[PDB]
Design a protein around this ligand. Structure first.
Ligand SMILES: Nc1ncnc2c1ncn2[C@@H]1O[C@H](COP(=O)(O)OP(=O)(O)OP(=O)(O)O)[C@@H](O)[C@H]1O
Ligand SMILES: Nc1ncnc2c1ncn2[C@@H]1O[C@H](COP(=O)(O)OP(=O)(O)OP(=O)(O)O)[C@@H](O)[C@H]1O
Ligand SMILES: [Mg+2]
Ligand SMILES: [Mg+2]
Lengths: 549, 540
């Protein structure tokens, strides 16, 4: 239950400057009432107290909120890649945003209520001190803790499924919204509405039990307080006949007794809210304490680097389906100033080789070396700056073109190299056509651009880092015959070709004739390897692929 | 400000019923402080066997009835204030799924998800947050009012004077609060966009090592929300302080009106503290009324999304049994509604025959995919006509038109269902033989057997578990499972290898299907009956 002290104590200093004030108000209540402004000068002073407490406490609570949401999201980004496909996007959105918001508001209300009533209850206990009747009340008090102890676990188990179904409904909503042309082109809006209602049925089912649980809790709290009041008043009335104390002695003792019961039933009411918040902080605190299974960032940052890449007996298996092995026996070498073209049928695993080269995953039974050193040894930023790739499906984010091209660079290159990289990739030939120049805005997922424009923007983004290892993977799929020769120049006519190691994965057989090396990958195994003429002279699978038409 | 009460109609047999457990509360509570005194005065008037037990029985029954009403009221209120939220969420999603395409480019997906997941609780938060103290308070106020009705003929100058102090500031505050109550939403939802742009492109972002960049952007977005929250809390606390400070004016005025008579000191000095109390409770009343109205009115954006009408044309009722398949363009010129006054098509005009293959070629940005998307009645041409047979395409039934005319887009987007739930997308019911036939027709059955669970394999978001060629084959099978009459496919040869491309050369081997194909490599479309070339949005 007390899992919050590790994420609140850093603010407690400010809370100290609240807590003293709390008793500065509490003794205001305990003090007896002791000149036409005599009722004024005190009263507005009390109002000033009502400005200094909640003026400060709220100023701390936001610092608890905006920090915590800055941490949990960070705990999302440290996890491994295969986590992000095990948990859907909508689930991560829901657990990042609304669970944290609900926990923060629940804490911000319940902490203030708990303090402001515990101090008053302690003062009310202190002021009434016959010792014997007070001790009788204090021994019958801890009997009432038996039922919320059995109620809190039910509350946690009930609220966890509420959060799960809300997250699933949000995932359905965002998946329906993010693919709107595909939804409308098949006329399947009613299916998405049906899926949303099917998700909301579980929420209604759990809420109809939440209401009953709240009603039973209020019933038990009021019944327990009432019965204890009748018990203490009865035993007092029976003790009156044996003398005990005077009428005026007990006429205030019973009043302080019912005030103490009023103080304690509020804590009895807020115990289930504490249990509900504890249940609400379940999936979030799993994200914070989860150990990422990927290796951490390295520390080497060599000032001089060559594009020497070695694959030695690399075998990989996807963690979703670990009983199969996608890659069996990869072993090859990439040198600077050379072009290696990796070709094969669909389902071979060329994108898996690209993912292994970019340190997205880890090999199962092999060695991958960059300049004689393993990939996790290098620093994360330096490694992803020295290795650049395009990918089969490029993605562009919703900002300016000059920020999409220079994305991820902390150095912040100026205008000149941005324009040079846009000219080199051929993107500038339409970028100057836009009315706002390079400062134009493109929306989410690049819906304002065509396929060739998106591929050109991705290529210009990958070019501007001046990488030593470059991976092109179907970068010429959507490009026409006019722009693609630029890519061909980028492979064979640019003077910077000697400074890069290019890994080309294309199904266009025109670009692989001039490659220094050609690899044929089928079933996760290298079938043929050599130059173009050596493969053409011998009879093999590459010859069949060429001579198929 | 009114429409949400129209959303409270199915909750009619609860809410007023909840008010029943309200009044059965106070009808007990108004008999609580009197007879409880009958329990304490017997301390000085000790009569154990008869009066004490009767007083205890009556007090126990009264408190038992009050608690039994209060618990049922709380259960009914907690059920209703979640049913309202569920109805609002469902109706908002059903309204969002109905609007046009151009609405989705102005706004962002994170904004709509934040409107779904954060503003609806703000709608449903208009319940009185603290109510038990309010119910004890109203009974106490009624009792104090009944006790101070003994000073009636001098209270004629008191009730009227309690109205107009510091109320002219109230009409200020409910303005200055409400705009803040909107702005925080416009600072929350935009911040909720940031967690989109990382997560949905996580495999992109880790490809460049920009995690700290996204974390910095998220913390910068959170700082503005923290500042707005602090501003709202400070303004509310300052208003409360100034109200409590300036409340004493009527107190000192009535103190002067009491002391000007020098009824005596035992009748006015022991009288002032109760109206000095209940002034705070009537201030609480007006404060909760203002806060409730502000919380209701702080969702003008959600109400506008509720009431927004699309620019889609009137739906058609036409759905004939036969369909020839002749397609005609009549001087069609189209400009996107998001970026107007820049035409993309500049007077296209052609005809598609039922039984021949028409290929379309053009450079990047020339507008071929715009033609393909316009042919499916996704958009509206500003000039010219798009005719299917002899009738305009907008006059057809939606499901019938999108079951007869189908397209394979530039980039297929897949969903998080099974493979059978993705091939049969948009179909109410279909047999497994149709799915198997469409799988053989697209050469997709060779890798259906390879993956686990057969055809019931789970496929993640956007087809992440599959490769690009398998996704292309699944999209082709999804298009072919409907047995269409008009089939538009653009760049279906993006990721397929040479063998599959040669094995899937002739789409028109059936000989009774209108096919439109868009390709960049001109050698692939040498078998087309008709070839169309367009430059800068004009046919050559
Ligand atoms: N995230 C993943 N989880 C599980 N299996 C995967 C995943 N990504 C790919 N696979 C599987 O790995 C194999 C090859 O994947 P990959 O995308 O690397 O193929 P490819 O040969 O590069 O594709 P293509 O020729 O279509 O470009 C397939 O069997 C595919 O189902
Ligand atoms: N949704 C959109 N909103 C605004 N402009 C758009 C939109 N879709 C396309 N455009 C613009 O229309 C022009 C061409 O669009 P389109 O995608 O139809 O071209 P295309 O020539 O078919 O593309 P490709 O390069 O894929 O062959 C470009 O200037 C592009 O920016
Ligand atoms: Mg691939
Ligand atoms: Mg196009």
């Amino acid at each position: 239950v007390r899992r919050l002290l590790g994420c609140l104590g850093s603010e407690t200093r400010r809370l100290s400057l609240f807590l003293v004030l709390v008793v500065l108000s509490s003794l205001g209540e305990m003090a007896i009432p002791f000149n036409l402004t005599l009722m004024s000068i005190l009263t507005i002073a009390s109002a000033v107290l009502e400005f200094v407490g909640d003026g400060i406490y709220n100023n701390t609570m936001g610092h608890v909120h905006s920090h915590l949401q800055g941490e949990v999201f960070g705990a999302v980004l440290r996890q491994e890649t295969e986590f992000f496909q095990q948990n859907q996007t909508g689930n991560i959105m829901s657990r990042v945003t609304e669970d944290t918001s609900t926990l923060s508001d629940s804490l911000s209300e319940n902490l203030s209520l708990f303090l402001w009533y515990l101090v008053r209850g302690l003062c009310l206990l202190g002021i009434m001190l016959s010792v014997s009747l007070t001790m009788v009340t204090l021994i019958t008090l801890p009997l009432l803790f038996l039922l919320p102890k059995k109620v809190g676990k039910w509350y946690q188990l009930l609220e966890v499924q509420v959060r799960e179904s809300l997250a699933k409904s949000s995932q359905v909503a965002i998946e329906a919204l993010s693919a709107m042309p595909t939804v409308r082109s098949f006329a399947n809006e009613e299916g998405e509405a049906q899926k949303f209602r099917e998700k909301l049925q579980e929420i209604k089912t759990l809420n109809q039990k939440e209401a009953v649980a709240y009603a039973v809790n209020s019933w038990t709290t009021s019944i327990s307080g009432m019965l204890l009041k009748v018990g203490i008043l009865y035993i007092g009335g029976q003790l009156v006949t044996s003398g005990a104390v005077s009428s005026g002695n007990l006429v205030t003792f019973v009043l302080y007794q019912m005030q103490f019961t009023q103080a304690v039933e509020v804590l009895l009411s807020i115990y289930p809210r504490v249990q509900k918040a504890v249940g609400s902080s379940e999936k979030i605190f799993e994200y914070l304490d989860r150990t990422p299974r990927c290796p951490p960032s390295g520390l080497l940052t060599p000032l001089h680097l060559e594009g020497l890449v070695q694959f030695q007996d690399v075998s990989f298996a996807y963690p979703n389906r670990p009983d199969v092995l996608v890659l069996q026996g990869l072993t090859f070498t990439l040198r600077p100033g050379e072009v290696t073209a990796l070709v094969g049928p669909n389902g071979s695993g060329k994108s898996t080789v690209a993912a292994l080269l970019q340190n997205l995953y880890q090999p199962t039974g092999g060695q991958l070396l960059l300049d004689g050193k393993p990939l996790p040894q290098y620093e994360h930023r330096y490694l992803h700056r020295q290795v650049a790739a395009v990918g089969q499906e490029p993605q562009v984010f919703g900002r300016s073109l000059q920020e999409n091209i220079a994305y991820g660079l902390t150095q912040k290159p100026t205008m000149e190299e941005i324009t040079a990289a846009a000219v080199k990739s051929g993107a500038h030939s339409f970028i100057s056509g836009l009315p706002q120049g390079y400062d134009t805005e493109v929306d989410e997922a690049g819906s304002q651009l065509s396929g060739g424009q998106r591929q050109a923007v991705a290529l210009a983004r990958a070019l501007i880092r001046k990488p030593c290892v470059l991976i092109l993977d179907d970068a010429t799929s959507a490009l026409d015959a006019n722009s693609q020769l630029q890519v061909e120049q980028l492979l064979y006519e640019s003077p910077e070709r000697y400074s890069r190691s290019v890994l080309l994965i294309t199904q266009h057989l025109s670009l692989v004739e001039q490659a220094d090396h050609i690899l044929f990958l089928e079933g996760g195994a290298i079938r043929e390897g050599g130059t173009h003429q050596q493969l053409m002279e011998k009879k093999g699978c590459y010859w069949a692929m060429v001579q198929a038409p | 400000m009114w429409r949400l009460l129209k959303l409270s109609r199915p909750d009619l047999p609860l809410l007023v019923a909840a008010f029943f457990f309200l009044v059965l509360a106070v009808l007990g509570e108004t008999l609580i402080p009197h007879y409880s005194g009958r329990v304490i005065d017997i301390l000085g008037g000790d009569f154990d066997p008869h009066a004490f037990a009767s007083a205890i029985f009556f007090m126990c029954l009264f408190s038992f009835g009050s608690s039994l009403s209060a618990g049922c009221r709380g259960g009914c209120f907690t059920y209703t204030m979640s049913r309202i939220n569920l109805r609002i969420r469902e109706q908002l999603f059903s309204s969002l799924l109905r609007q046009d395409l151009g609405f989705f480019q102005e706004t962002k997906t994170g904004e709509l998800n934040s409107r779904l997941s954060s503003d609806t609780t703000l709608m449903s938060n208009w319940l009185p947050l603290n109510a038990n103290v309010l119910l004890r308070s109203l009974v106490k106020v009624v009792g104090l009012y009944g006790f101070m009705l003994s000073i009636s003929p001098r209270l004629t100058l008191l009730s009227l004077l309690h109205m107009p102090f510091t109320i002219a500031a109230e009409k200020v505050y409910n303005t200055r609060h409400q705009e803040v109550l909107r702005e925080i939403q416009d600072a929350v939802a935009r911040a909720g966009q940031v967690v989109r742009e990382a997560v949905g492109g996580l495999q992109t972002v880790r490809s460049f090592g920009a995690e700290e960049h996204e974390v910095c952007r998220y913390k910068e977005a959170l700082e503005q929300c923290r500042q707005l929250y602090w501003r709202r809390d400070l303004e509310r606390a300052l208003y409360l302080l100034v109200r409590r400070v300036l409340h004493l004016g009527v107190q000192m005025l009535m103190l002067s009106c009491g002391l000007q008579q020098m009824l005596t000191q035992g009748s006015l000095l022991s009288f002032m503290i109760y109206q000095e109390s209940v002034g705070s409770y009537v201030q609480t009343l007006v404060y909760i009324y203002g806060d409730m109205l502000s919380n209701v009115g702080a969702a003008e954006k959600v109400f506008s999304y509720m009431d927004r009408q699309p620019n889609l044309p009137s739906p058609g009722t036409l759905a004939p049994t036969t369909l020839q398949g002749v397609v005609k363009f009549q001087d069609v010129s189209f400009a996107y509604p998001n970026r107007p006054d820049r035409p993309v098509l500049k007077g296209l005009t052609f005809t598609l025959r039922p039984g021949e293959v028409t290929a379309l070629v053009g450079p990047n940005g020339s507008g071929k995919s715009t033609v393909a998307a316009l042919l499916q009645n996704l958009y509206q041409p500003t000039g010219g006509q798009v005719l299917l047979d002899e009738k305009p395409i907008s006059q057809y039934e939606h499901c019938y038109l999108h079951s007869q005319v189908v397209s394979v887009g530039q980039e297929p987007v897949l969903f998080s269902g099974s493979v059978r739930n993705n091939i049969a997308y948009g179909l109410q019911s279909c047999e497994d033989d149709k799915v198997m036939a469409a799988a053989q027709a697209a050469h997709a059955d060779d890798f259906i057997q390879e993956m686990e669970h057969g055809i019931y394999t789970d496929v993640g978001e956007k087809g992440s578990q599959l490769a690009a060629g398998q996704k292309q084959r699944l999209a082709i099978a999804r298009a072919l499972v409907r047995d269409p009459r008009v089939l538009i496919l653009d760049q279906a040869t993006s990721a397929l290898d040479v063998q599959c491309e040669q094995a899937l050369q002739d789409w028109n081997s059936r000989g009774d299907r209108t096919v439109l194909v868009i390709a960049h490599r001109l050698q692939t479309v040498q078998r087309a009956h008709q070839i169309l070339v367009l430059q800068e949005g004009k046919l050559q």
